[PDB]
Amino acid sequence: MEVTVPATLNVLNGSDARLPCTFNSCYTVNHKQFSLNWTYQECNNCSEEMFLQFRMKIINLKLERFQDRVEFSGNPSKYDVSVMLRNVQPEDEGIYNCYIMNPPDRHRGHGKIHLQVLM
Amino acid sequence: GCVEVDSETEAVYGMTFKILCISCKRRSETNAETFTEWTFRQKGTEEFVKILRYENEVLQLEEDERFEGRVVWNGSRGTKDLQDLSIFITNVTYNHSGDYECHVYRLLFFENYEHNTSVVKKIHIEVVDKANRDMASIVSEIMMYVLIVVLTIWLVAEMIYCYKKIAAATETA
Amino acid sequence: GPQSFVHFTKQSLALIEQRIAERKSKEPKPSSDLEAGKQLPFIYGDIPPGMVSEPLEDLDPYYADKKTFIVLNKGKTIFRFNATPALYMLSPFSPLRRISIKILVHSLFSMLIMCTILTNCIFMTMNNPPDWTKNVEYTFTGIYTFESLVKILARGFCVGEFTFLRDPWNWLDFVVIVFAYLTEFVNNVSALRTFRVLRALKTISVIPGLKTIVGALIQSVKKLSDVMILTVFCLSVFALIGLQLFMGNLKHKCFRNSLENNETLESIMNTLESEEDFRKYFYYLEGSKDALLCGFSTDSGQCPEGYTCVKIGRNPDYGYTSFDTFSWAFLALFRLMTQDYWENLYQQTLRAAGKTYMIFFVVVIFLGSFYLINLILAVVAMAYEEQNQANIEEAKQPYWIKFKKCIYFIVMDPFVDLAITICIVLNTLFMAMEHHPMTEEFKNVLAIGNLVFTGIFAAEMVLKLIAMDPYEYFQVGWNIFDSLIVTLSLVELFLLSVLRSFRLLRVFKLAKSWPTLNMLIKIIGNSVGALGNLTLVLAIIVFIFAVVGMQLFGKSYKECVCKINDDCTLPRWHMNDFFHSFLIVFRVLCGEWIETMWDCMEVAGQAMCLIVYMMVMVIGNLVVLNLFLALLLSSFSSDNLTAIEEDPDANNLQIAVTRIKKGINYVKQTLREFILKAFGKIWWNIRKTCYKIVEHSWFESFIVLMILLSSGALAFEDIYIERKKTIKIILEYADKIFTYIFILEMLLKWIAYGYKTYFTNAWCWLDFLIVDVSLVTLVANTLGYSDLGPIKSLRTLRALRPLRALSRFEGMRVVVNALIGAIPSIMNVLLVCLIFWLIFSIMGVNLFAGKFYECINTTDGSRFPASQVPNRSECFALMNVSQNVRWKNLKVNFDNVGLGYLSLLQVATFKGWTIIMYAAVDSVNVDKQPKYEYSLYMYIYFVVFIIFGSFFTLNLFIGVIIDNFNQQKKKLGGQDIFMTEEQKKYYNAMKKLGSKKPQKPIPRPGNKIQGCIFDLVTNQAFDISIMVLICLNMVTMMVEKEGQSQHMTEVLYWINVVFIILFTGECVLKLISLRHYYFTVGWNIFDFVVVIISIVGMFLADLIETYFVSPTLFRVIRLARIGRILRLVKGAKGIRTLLFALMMSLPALFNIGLLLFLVMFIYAIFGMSNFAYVKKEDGINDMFNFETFGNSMICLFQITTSAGWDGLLAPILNSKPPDCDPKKVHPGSSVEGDCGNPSVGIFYFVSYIIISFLVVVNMYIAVILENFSVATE
Ligand SMILES: CC(C)CCC[C@@H](C)[C@H]1CC[C@H]2[C@@H]3CC=C4C[C@@H](OC(=O)CCC(=O)O)CC[C@]4(C)[C@H]3CC[C@]12C
Ligand SMILES: Nc1[nH]ncc1-c1cc(Cl)ccc1Oc1cc(F)c(S(=O)(=O)Nc2cscn2)cc1Cl
Ligand SMILES: *[C@@H]1O[C@H](CO)[C@@H](O[C@@H]2O[C@H](CO)[C@@H](O)[C@H](O)[C@H]2NC(C)=O)[C@H](O)[C@H]1NC(C)=O
Ligand SMILES: *[C@@H]1O[C@H](CO)[C@@H](O)[C@H](O)[C@H]1NC(C)=O
Ligand SMILES: *[C@@H]1O[C@H](CO)[C@@H](O)[C@H](O)[C@H]1NC(C)=O
Ligand code: NA
């Protein structure tokens, strides 16, 4: 699967960050079977943290490190699974991954975004 | 494949008779489990009484004096998907004259769907001393003979007319 | 003359400019011989050595005034340039332009460009090129830029006359260069790569003789303008008819009656996505992707008990098959016209609407499928004739010596050549004995025989090589071919499976004495010879289409695969790689495009796939037709001129025949000599009155009526005859009466004509045989011999009693006379194609014998993988484990030569061929489980077989049939051979109709208002306005669709009412203006009838739709709206001429249709007699079978076009368990068994398709004759 994500995303501290992630899939996105995972790792060899998953509807795990600042900002039917980080803090710096599975597509999509927070 | 043919309505005393009951399912490729029940109402009587029930390759005959030891199965064999429900009478008596009902209970198996349907066929049987010849055969045979006779006399008359005319023409020359 | 050669110098340019200035102060075609791109005339002789490839003065006087200069190459090629400086810098005398010109005209330049283009074409076939390829792409781009720069510098860019940009073919080069650079600098990858296919079109401008072929192909199209307009009009009219009749019918589905949880149809339909969930509410046949269709009439498809028919859901075939909108209806009508899988649409429409609507398909086939195709072939035929006529018209305007001589004497023409021919025949007969269940002794015998034949042929080669000199030996092409065959056989002996079949080509050595095999040799030789450029163009076009398809849709097939396959694997036909993409294009050329186009539209969208498939169909079919026509006409008229005698050198076979005529006759005469040395007016009057009786018209009418009644009585003997006891008895007694009548008729003819006259007549012989069969059947029944097997089988011969009608109707008599006269010419070509097909059959037995066996799971009918059960023994072990396991072979295969013939017949007709190809390409070995596309490149076998035994074989057949019918016409004075005398009189009368001189001008009424209306209606603008009103009405009918709101229906109906009112007003105005002269024109009569039926039909349709409930009657009555749009042919002159030619063709078509209907009737009676109880699998089902006369006619009309005859043949090939059940009990009948007879069924279907082919060829030829007469008179 082709996953369109920005490799490096620089967002000002205190502002809102949109993390774009779109996929080009042949088949229509079936909400009863579409899968979406948004993980977070401090480094490439670090642990991934599950914070927003789509199994049937938008499930936000409400991680303590993000408070309630993580929002869904896409449309699965329109091949957009972007997520929104309100009031980005310096600790939000890290690696964000969007995993996409859209059956009956065999392949699994994976996009990686390196979020950098400047003063 | 399967043709619904009506039963003969006349049986002769002392010989054998087959009562025809054919119930073809609407599509031949479907799979069904069928069992049948027969009821008989004799002449001068009003109530239909059950005489037999065929299910699972075995025939159950009711305790009836007019049919005990006199009826055998003549329908489909080797299947639960019966399309022929005919019965066979070995010794026709005057007590077999009357009306018969052939109840067909067919259970069709579809994809996540079971349909229980039913069909009823009515047969009227008259027991007679001798086999009355059909009107159609007699009429057709008589018509064939009269047609052949008419054609041959027409041809003969035409030949004699033409022969006389040509003989007169030859005599003229 | 030849002395006219001088270098172009500055003085010459100054003189030319001075002449131009003089012309300006004062203020013709050039030599086609001296025209650019042509050989310099021989009148100029050789060129001085220092003069070639140099700027020279203009030779042509026409350009001698203007500023030009000519450069001649070493091949004496004339190239014209412009003396004006190139981009105002480079002059002809400048060294830079001199070098550019020197490079431009050379052999190594064109050859280098050819090699570069071919290499780029080879690289274009890669779907996933490696990363080392980009350097090669840059090299290809640089090479093209080199030639572009050379041409621009030498010729100038745009300003001049003979400059780079004036030539249309350099625009392609410029587009290629700019696209390559622009797309490289800017950086859809598929879109960019599809533009690289334009480099493959530079092939036309580099190889000589290709531009002229392309120009001729473009010229052939321009003559097709009127035929295309008529085709579009007819397809639109039939699409409107189909839209009106079958709208929404393909949406009928069997919906279950009982629903739980308070569910209702609307509540179900919006919560269903998968076919698994659809299968729980609708009825599906096992292994089907679409729901079973149903209808509401008694003659439509039936739902199972528990389901009810309802119009809901999507249409079949992914929804692409429907009559819901005008566009889908137009696609369906195009599919019917091209007869691509049309039997499927026919079956679906009959299932959903009823068997009565077969009338629509018969009319559509006859008009669009047969007649519209006829005009396309006819017009292209004339286009090449006029091109051919113009082409020729303008063209005409010591001990070693001793024993070599001994061996040379040993090679005797009467004996050695005849012995070699006999050995060749015995050899090809020997290899036809190979078959799969063959014992080791038989294989040993075949091997030793093959070795012996090879040794003898090698000995012949060696003897001929040592007898006459090897240098003299390789002078004859036949000797070279024999040497190649011998060395191939020796190479095989030292060692493939295919190489063992290369010794089959020695059969072509009989073409020296066999004249119609030499015709095939010349036909094949011409395609690669005189016609090599056209075949090359066809190959280039096929390659371009294949690569374009692969680039456009190849990745779409892989990514979107799960939409067209449940296993999410590539289907059998796809464009992911070059080979399969080429296979798709070849299959489209064969005539099958709809089924792959469905998958293409599913994976890549409708618009792109539709455009690509339509372009492929049009261009490819046009080029194939052009190649076929050129081959036909060349090998027919240009090759055969009787230049030499019949075997001018006395043929060795003929010399041996003369020796035999000497020897056998002399020996027989000597044996005879040795034997002789050792030793009553009344009877004449009876004959005369019988003659006077039989010859009368009343007798003929009576016998004809008897024949019709006796033939029609056969149609009643179906599987339902036991429900009609009275009719059964009536028919038995009527059969007795008919037998009596025909016996009496036979006796009367015997008395009238005598035994000699009666038995010299063939029709009387046919009647005699039929009546004897009937009498034997009658006598056997009476004496108790009614159930004997031979007697019961002889009863089925009553289906030949309709043959008595052949002599009674004159049209069938003349058509049968034409066919019988044609038979002798057909037989020689039949033998030729039988030998040609025997070669391919032996090769197929070599390749595929015994390898189509597979282990399948019977319940689902799927082949097991090869990881488990890879062997026959493993399959039998699996049967020992699992019950529903079978090691099954295909019914039609290459196990022996006869089965190979059946397979080749299926492949040549493209009916059932795909299963054979899949089995062949999955082949591994004998007793080995097949693997998916293990032998992938055995598709080449089928492609070669199609090309040779389907294209060239049909080419030869048509070529000989043309000459045969031409000779038939000549001997009888040129009269039509398919027409009777009275038909000829009516034909001449209708000929006078289409040639009338302009009638008297219509008198103008003296009244003022009447006169003004007369001037108004007489004007041409009135007719043009009526035509545009008819076009607007056509568009309004096109707007109508499925599921439209009632408001839209009312608006469309009111617009139609307005149109009807306008047309009625036009009719009233014409009636007022022309008075009684209005009815003196046939077209005005047609218009008057049209307006009357329009008004009456609109009011009747309103009454039916509001006060009655009869949708069928409403749709049938609404057909009167078609009459309004049929008036468009009034203004179109060309399509009017084409329709005149059609109506001219009608009588002969009527006679041939009568013969075809009689043959269909006979085959239908035989079908109900034989195949009424076969298993309902493959093409035989509950609606399309042989149970009744109507069903048999439905089946036989379908296979008259050969569509789906394999599916009907398949169930009849079942003869043994577990394929069939010989003890099958059928309720309501005493017939036992559902098994078919393979021999009878094969004979049935093969004979029927052959007879249909012959009759249809007659219809083609008749229509062609009428069209050719019309267009050139
Ligand atoms: C007019 C020309 C083109 C054809 C002339 C006929 C012969 C050259 C060929 C054509 C069909 C051939 C026959 C096709 C099939 C068979 C059956 C084959 O035996 C089997 O298939 C046995 C199968 C088994 O035992 O299970 C033996 C050869 C034979 C008679 C072939 C012998 C050679 C034949 C007669
Ligand atoms: N029913 C309706 N709604 N709105 C207007 C009307 C209407 C009004 C009137 Cl005054 C008369 C009939 C009417 O109904 C039709 C009008 C048509 F024009 C056609 S037609 O387009 O098929 N033409 C045609 C020629 S012959 C058979 N049909 C079909 C119909 Cl039912
Ligand atoms: C046909 O297929 C089987 C596939 O298993 C071949 O392999 C043999 O299979 C059996 C049972 O699994 C093993 O016990 C044998 O050891 C296998 N053979 C060998 C040599 O390893 C089998 O050999 C094949 N038989 C034929 C006739 O080709
Ligand atoms: C019907 O019964 C008779 C008498 O037992 C028997 O001979 C015959 O085979 C039977 N036929 C069928 C159809 O079972
Ligand atoms: C109708 O549907 C409702 C659910 O919406 C259900 O509760 C009720 O029992 C149903 N009644 C019938 C008549 O089936
Ligand atoms: Na197809």
Residue numbers in the entry:
A (entry chain C): 30 to 148
B (entry chain B): 20 to 192
C (entry chain A): 8 to 34, 47 to 206, 209 to 418, 728 to 825, 831 to 1014, 1175 to 1768
Q: What does the article say, verbatim?
A:
Our incentive to solve the structure of PF-05089771 bound to wild-type (WT) human Nav1.7 was to verify if the chimeric VSD can faithfully recapitulate all binding details. The binding mode of PF-05089771 in the intact Nav1.7-VSDIV is remarkably similar to the chimeric one. As coordination details and the molecular basis for the subtype-specificity have been thoroughly discussed by Ahuja and co-workers, we will not elaborate on this one. Whereas small molecules like PF-05089771 resides in an extracellular cavity of VSDIV, peptide toxins like ProTx-II and HWTX-IV bind to the extracellular periphery of the VSD, partly immersed in the lipid bilayer. Per this definition, PF-05089771 binds to site V4EC, HWTX-IV and LqhIII to V4EM, and Dc1a to site V2EP. Site V4C has been extensively explored for subtype-specific antagonists, such as PF-05089771 for Nav1.7 and ICA121431 for Nav1.3.
